Amino acid sequence: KVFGRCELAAAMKRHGLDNYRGYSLGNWVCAAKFESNFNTQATNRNTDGSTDYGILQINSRWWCNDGRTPGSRNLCNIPCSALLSSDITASVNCAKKIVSDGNGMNAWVAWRNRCKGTDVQAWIRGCRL
Known about the structure:
mainly alpha, Lysozyme, three-stranded antiparallel β-sheet, 3 strands, 30% helix, globular
């Protein structure tokens, strides 16, 4: 499904992402917008054989297992198909593990490119949270 901006902000908040590891809610909403355009079913193939899955475009080489990626490490221990669900729970749980990995939100290229620095709070203004 395609989440509406405020609808997603409320779901990610309910799931403890506001200020998780030092990143305010807007950072996460901003990452979702440029990563998948709020679509839980987005997928994208990479030159190395991996695919990025879901609302947060979590990569199959290190994080989830899709059974077709050479060098798969499955560090969130989850099938990549669980990440395309309408329930963002599995994507959120795995993102909490990715961000804890000593680099933070730099794991998401769209985030470092389009969100890091800007007024990320704009992503949450006008919503009831």
